[PDB]
mmCIF file of C-alpha atoms and ligand atoms in Angstrom:
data_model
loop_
_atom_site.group_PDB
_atom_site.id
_atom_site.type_symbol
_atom_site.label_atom_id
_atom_site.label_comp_id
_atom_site.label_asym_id
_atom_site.label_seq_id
_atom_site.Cartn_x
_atom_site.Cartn_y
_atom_site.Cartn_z
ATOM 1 C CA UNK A 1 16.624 34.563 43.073
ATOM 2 C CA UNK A 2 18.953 33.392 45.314
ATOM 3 C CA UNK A 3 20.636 30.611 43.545
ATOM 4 C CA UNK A 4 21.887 32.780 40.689
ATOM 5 C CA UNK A 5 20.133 31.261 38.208
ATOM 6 C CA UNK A 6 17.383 32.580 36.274
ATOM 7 C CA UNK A 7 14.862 29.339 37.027
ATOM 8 C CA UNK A 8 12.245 28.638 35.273
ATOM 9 C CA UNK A 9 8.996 27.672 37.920
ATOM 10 C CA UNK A 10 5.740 28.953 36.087
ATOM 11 C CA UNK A 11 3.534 27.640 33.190
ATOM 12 C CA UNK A 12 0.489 29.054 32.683
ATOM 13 C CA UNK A 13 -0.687 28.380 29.266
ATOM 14 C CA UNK A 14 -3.776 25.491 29.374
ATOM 15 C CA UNK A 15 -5.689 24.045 32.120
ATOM 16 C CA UNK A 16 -6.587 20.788 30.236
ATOM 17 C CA UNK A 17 -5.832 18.794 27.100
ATOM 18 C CA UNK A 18 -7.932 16.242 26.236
ATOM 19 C CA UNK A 19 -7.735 15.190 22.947
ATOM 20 C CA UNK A 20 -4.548 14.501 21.495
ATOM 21 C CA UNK A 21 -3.911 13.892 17.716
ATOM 22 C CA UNK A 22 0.012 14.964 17.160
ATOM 23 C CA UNK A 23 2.958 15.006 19.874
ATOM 24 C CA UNK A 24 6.768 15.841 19.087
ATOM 25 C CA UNK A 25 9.336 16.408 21.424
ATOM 26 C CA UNK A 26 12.845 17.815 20.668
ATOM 27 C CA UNK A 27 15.822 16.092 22.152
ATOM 28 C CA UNK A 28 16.770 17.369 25.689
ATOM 29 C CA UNK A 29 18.981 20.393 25.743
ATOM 30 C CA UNK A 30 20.084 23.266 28.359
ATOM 31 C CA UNK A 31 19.215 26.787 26.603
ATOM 32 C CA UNK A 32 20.047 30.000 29.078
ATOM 33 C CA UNK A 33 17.619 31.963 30.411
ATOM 34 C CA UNK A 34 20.187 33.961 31.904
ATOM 35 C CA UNK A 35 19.300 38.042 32.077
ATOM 36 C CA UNK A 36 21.378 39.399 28.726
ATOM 37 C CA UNK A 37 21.113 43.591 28.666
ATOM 38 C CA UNK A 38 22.053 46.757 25.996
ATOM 39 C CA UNK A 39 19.979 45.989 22.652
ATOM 40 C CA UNK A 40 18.505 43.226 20.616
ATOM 41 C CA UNK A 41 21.388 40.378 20.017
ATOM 42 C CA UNK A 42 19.419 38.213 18.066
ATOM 43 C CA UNK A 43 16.920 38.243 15.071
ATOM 44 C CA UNK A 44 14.572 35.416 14.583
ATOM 45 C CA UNK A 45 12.315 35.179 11.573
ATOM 46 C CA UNK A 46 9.200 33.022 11.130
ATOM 47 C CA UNK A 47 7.096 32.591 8.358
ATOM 48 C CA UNK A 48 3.394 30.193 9.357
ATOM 49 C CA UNK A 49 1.128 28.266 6.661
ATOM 50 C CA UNK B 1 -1.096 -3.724 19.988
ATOM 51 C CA UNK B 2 0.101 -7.929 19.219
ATOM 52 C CA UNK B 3 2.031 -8.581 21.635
ATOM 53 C CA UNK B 4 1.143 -6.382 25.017
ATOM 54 C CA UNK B 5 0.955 -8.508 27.943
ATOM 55 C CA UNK B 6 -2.605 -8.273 29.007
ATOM 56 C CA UNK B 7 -5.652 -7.263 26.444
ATOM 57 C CA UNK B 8 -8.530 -5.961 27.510
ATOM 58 C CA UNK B 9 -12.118 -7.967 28.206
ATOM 59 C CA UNK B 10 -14.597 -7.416 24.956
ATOM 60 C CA UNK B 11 -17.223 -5.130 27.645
ATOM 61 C CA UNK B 12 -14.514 -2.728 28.080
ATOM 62 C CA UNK B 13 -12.546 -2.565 24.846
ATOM 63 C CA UNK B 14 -9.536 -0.435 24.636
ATOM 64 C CA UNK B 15 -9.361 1.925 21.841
ATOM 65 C CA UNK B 16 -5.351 2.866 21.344
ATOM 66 C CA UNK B 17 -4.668 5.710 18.957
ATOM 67 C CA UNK B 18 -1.716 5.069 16.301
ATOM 68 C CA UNK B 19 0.498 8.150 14.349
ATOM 69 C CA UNK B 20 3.542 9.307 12.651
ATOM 70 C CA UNK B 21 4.852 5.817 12.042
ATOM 71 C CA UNK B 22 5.187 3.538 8.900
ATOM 72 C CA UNK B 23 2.979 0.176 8.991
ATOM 73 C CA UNK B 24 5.497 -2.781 8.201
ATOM 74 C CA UNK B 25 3.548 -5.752 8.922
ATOM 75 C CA UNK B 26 6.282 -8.585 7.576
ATOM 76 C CA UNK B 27 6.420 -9.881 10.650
ATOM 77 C CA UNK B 28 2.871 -9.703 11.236
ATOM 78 C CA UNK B 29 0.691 -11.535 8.150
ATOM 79 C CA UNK B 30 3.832 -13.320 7.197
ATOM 80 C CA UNK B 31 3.918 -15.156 10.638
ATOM 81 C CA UNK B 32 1.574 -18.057 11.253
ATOM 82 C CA UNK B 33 1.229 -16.459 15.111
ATOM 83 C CA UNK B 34 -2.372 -15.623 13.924
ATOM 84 C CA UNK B 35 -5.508 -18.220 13.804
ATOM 85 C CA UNK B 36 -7.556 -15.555 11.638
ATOM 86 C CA UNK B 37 -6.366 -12.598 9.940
ATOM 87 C CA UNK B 38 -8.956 -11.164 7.655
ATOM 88 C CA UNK B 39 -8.953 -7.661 5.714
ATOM 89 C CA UNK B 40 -12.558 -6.976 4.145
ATOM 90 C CA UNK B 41 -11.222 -4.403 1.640
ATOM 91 C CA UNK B 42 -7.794 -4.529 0.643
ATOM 92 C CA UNK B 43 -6.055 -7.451 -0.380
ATOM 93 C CA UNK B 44 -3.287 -8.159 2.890
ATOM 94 C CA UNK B 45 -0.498 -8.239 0.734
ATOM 95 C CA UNK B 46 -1.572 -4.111 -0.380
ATOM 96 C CA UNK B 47 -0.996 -3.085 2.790
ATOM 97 C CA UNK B 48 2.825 -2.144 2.523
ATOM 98 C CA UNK B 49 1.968 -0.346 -0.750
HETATM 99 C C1 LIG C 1 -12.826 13.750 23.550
HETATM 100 O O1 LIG C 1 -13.254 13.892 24.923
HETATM 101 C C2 LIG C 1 -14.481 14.617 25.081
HETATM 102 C C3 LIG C 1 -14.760 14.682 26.565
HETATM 103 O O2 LIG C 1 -14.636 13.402 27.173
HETATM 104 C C4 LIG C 1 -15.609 13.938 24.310
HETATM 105 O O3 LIG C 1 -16.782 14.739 24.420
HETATM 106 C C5 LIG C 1 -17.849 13.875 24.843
HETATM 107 O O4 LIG C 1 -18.434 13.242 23.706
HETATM 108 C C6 LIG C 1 -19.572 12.324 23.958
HETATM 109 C C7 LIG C 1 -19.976 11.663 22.632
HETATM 110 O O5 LIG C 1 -20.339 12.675 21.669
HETATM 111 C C8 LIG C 1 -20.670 13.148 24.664
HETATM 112 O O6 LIG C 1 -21.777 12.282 25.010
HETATM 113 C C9 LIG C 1 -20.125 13.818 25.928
HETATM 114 O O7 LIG C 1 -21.211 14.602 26.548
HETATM 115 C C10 LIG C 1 -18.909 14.696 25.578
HETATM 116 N N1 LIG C 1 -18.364 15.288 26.831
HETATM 117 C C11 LIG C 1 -17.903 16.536 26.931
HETATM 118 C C12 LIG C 1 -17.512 17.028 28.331
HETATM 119 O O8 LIG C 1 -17.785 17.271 25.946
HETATM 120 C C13 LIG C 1 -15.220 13.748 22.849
HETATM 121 O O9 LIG C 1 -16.225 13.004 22.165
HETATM 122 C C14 LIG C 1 -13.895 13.009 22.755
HETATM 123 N N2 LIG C 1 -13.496 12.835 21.368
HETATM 124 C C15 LIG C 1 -12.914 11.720 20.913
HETATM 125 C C16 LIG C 1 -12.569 11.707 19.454
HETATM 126 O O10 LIG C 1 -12.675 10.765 21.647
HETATM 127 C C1 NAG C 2 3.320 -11.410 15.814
HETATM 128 C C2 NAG C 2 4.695 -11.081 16.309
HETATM 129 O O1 NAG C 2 5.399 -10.239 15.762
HETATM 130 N N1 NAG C 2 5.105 -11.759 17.382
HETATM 131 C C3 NAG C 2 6.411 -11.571 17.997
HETATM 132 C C4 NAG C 2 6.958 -12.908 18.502
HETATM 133 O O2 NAG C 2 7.138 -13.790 17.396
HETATM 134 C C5 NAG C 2 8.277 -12.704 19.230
HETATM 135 O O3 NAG C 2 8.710 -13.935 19.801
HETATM 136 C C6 NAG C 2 8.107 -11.667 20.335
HETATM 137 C C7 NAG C 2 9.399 -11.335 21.045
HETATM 138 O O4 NAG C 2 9.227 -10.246 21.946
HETATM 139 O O5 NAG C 2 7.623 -10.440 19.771
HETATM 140 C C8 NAG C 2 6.333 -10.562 19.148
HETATM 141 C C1 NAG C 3 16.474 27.684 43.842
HETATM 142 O O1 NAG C 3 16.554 26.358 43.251
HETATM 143 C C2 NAG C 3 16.035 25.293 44.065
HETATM 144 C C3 NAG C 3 16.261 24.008 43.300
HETATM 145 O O2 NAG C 3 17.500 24.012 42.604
HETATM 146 C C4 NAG C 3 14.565 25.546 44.363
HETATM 147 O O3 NAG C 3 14.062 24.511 45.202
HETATM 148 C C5 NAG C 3 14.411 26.890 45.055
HETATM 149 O O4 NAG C 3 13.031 27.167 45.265
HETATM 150 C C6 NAG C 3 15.017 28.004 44.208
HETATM 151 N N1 NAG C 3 14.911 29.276 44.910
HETATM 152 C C7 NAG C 3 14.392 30.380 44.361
HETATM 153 C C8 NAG C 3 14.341 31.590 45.245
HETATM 154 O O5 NAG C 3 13.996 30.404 43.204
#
């Protein structure tokens, strides 16, 4: 939009959080967001227990 | 938790939560700073272990 630069602006995943037991934040970086196209570039696996 | 500026009045006790740390408290029972430190079920020397 505009300011060619895919910006991030919307987060829309809770309303409220109350009651916190655990809180980690990584250290501060600048990922893209920038609009890649053709196929899939990258493969990320993840394995949850 | 020792050393913050203002505590809170008994009526209206504070209730901080405490996580992901390690509980060092050689410069805590070692230091004469307190007029009363009791545990009622350890011995305050277990504490580190
Ligand atoms: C976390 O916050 C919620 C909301 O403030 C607490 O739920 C309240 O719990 C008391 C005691 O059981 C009840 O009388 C209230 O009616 C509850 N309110 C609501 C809106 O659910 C909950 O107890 C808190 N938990 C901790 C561990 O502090
Ligand atoms: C119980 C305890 O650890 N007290 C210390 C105190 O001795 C020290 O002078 C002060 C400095 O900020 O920090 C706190
Ligand atoms: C472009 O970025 C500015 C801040 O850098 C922001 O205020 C503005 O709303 C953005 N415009 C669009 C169209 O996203």
């Amino acid at each position: 939009k505009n300011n060619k630069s895919w910006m991030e602006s919307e987060f829309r995943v809770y309303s409220s959080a109350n009651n916190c037991t655990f809180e980690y934040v990584s250290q501060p970086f600048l990922m893209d967001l920038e609009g890649k196209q053709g196929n899939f570039k990258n493969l990320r696996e993840f394995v949850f227990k | 938790v020792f050393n913050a500026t203002r505590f809170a009045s008994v009526y209206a006790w504070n209730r901080k939560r405490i996580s992901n740390c390690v509980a060092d408290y050689s410069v805590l029972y070692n230091s004469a700073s307190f007029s009363t430190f009791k545990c009622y079920g350890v011995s305050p020397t277990k504490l580190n272990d």
